[PDB]
Amino acid sequence: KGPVCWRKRVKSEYMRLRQLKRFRRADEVKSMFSSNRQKILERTEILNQEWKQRRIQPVHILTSVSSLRGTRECSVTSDLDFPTQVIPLKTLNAVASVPIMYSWSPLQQNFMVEDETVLHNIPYMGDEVLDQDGTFIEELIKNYDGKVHGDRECGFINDEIFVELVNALGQYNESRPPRSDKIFEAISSMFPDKGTAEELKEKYKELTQPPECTPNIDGPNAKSVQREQSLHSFHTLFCRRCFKYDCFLHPFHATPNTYKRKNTETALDNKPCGPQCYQHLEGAKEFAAALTAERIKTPNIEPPENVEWSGAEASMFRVLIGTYYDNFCAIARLIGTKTCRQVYEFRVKESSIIAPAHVYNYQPCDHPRQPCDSSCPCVIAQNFCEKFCQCSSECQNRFPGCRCKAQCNTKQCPCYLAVRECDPDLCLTCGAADHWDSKNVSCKNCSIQRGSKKHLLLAPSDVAGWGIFIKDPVQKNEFISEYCGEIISQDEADRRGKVYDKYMCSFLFNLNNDFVVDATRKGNKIRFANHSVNPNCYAKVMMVNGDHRIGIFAKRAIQTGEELFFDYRY
Amino acid sequence: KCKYSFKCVNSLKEDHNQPLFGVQFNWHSKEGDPLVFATVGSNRVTLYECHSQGEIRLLQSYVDADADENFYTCAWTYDSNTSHPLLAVAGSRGIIRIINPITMQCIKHYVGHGNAINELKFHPRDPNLLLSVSKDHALRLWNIQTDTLVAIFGGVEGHRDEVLSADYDLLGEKIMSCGMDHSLKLWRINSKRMMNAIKESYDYNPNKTNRPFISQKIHFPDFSTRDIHRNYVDCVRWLGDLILSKSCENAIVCWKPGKMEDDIDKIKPSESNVTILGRFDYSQCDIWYMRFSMDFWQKMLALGNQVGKLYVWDLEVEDPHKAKCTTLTHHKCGAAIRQTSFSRDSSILIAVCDDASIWRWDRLR
């Protein structure tokens, strides 16, 4: 085993594999080429046949009427010794140019974006620049550890070719690992733009193809599966905060006591079912409530009816008894294919069967029995616990709502005073909670959450390039819009920042310690608000429902058609 | 041995001295008419007519009254009403001008593009379907009859830096494009969404409705890959259902989406494989913005390199290639050869260079 030994061995295998693959394919490709050539013949023929039907009168030249001694001319000199040809030169007149812009996708709320550890692209500026200072091109590459796609020694790589390189390198190696940990280092160092070694090992895992799938409950191979496996997919993938599965905003998963519920309420008596109920021989309500009172700690004379449980039904019971707790009236009604009676018997059968056996970004805390004390992430982060935290109802570190009568746009509101928009579950009194579709409302500290922005108009800037203009007139301190973009790590900002530093304009706006908003690749209209030191706006970052979100307000009353600017402090 | 042999029958030079970035034979001209071509460079477009033999007649030339403009590419089409030819030129100002060389006037202009147009293309089947690629990272498909923008092929899974080339396939069913981000991208236009967007674009009239035309903004391609090339990919062409594309790795690579077997129209966006069939090795084309071309019947493939040497390969050669190209130099051709253009009949081959020079090479009798 040698560090450079593995590389040379990876190199010569690769070099061999590429050759023996080429000769096998070289047979097949000849057939593919012949075949493809057959496709050409046809489709070219079709166009050519279309060309016959066109009569295009081409090639007309014009000298007359005679040159008035106003127009310039174009000459063309010849190495054939035919005299130099001369033509007056047609002026293609006036067209207003548009300001420069690069294409960008529109957003309503921001977008979390993963770091990229290699810049896939080296920016062409440099010919007119003539490589000065060529130092920039080195220092740009240093931020990426010197990793650019595609910087290697090795001349090519593909997936079908890659898996054979891992398999021919496992054959090569006594054995087995059975899949090595050492070799993923060697094949990354040969391929910087495909590494780190970690990333190649996970790429190999996706490529070689399914447990722990629980199959379809609505389907023909539905298994009888425990509660947590039937629901494994939903709990693991649902976002509590924004209410989507695999959201674009929040990367941390469930916590997992977020998807455990308070067991109460209520456990109340409700009979009859009715009427073919779980009744009424000793053991009906008694042994039901008993079995779970025997199961919590740390009858049934009639012979139990004979019905058969499919894989779906059995799972669906199990999942329901979790959330419905012995209410077999409810469960039976829900399962729909069994009756109150049969659910109870299956419970009984299942109780008797054996199991085989500086500001930071908010991210909720969840230490189940112990309090939000000086070891709590939130209080370490010097942030409140929010609704999404899994601590006490009455934790001392939870932001309470505002009780405000109305607007809550002054210091007397506790929300406004914390640089927070209201909470539509907490601020029940101002009307941050009130009627939704009616998206203008009494509380005027909820506008970011509601996306309730003024109408903005795009035209060229009365200073430079592009600028942005408000349609409808607005007063001092009033909400104009949210500054939206990508969300990225201070690292990935530092990489993109350096490149935008060379273009002498950046669209990065600093959100908190952990994150920056980058309206460059994707954003929204207010991004065209220019930088003016004496601006007609300002940019307040606020805290809204766990997300930190930028807010662009007026700094002054503004006339219709005015161009919006704000100072860039960072 | 090799095929096919040529001899330099002429050379000439424009008056500006700036580079000829683009050169295009008029393939729309009916047989038994003179073989025409156009060149773009400096702030101008020039039109030349070949004559038997050697003689290249200077027909027309046009200068943008904006001093700063600089045309990068041209492409021929026709007015299927009046049966005129129509040349399209685009350049650094991000503005597409349409010249009609029978009226000798710029009859149309489109000014939606953010930055320069590095290539223009016209739909083989539809003489109104212009496709502008750009340094602004989006391709734009226009209907030049209706003054409408059909489709903008850029956004999320669009290109990440400059789009340098694209080609319609032979039937006009899909665009394969490429650019600076190292990436080739495949964009179908036979899909219901596009074919509908195309139709409604014809039906669009601005005196009939207060609305604008609703240009489909396409954010996602039907395929993408970055595993072929290792720097900017500057020219890409459709050889039927295979892809010819060059980066500056001293070869044009013939590859296909997916595995050996996987059919092009059965490829799904998520497809992670490609396969290299062959490479057409050349030498000394290290700079970018070096295009190749092929003849109408796709029997010959021509790339002019940066030291004035033209490489011409045969595409009836089974297997690599490997061997062997028909290499043709001249002792006064030095500058970089931006782009080659065959005449329709493969008799003539034009090339244009950085030094404003134009090189006419004709074939065996």
Binding site: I122, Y124, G126, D127, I137, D151 | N231, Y232, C248, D286, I287, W288, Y289, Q306, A336, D354
Partner: peptide
Amino acid sequence: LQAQRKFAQS
């Protein structure tokens, strides 16, 4: 290893 120029070079 290196970055691409549109023009060579003299």
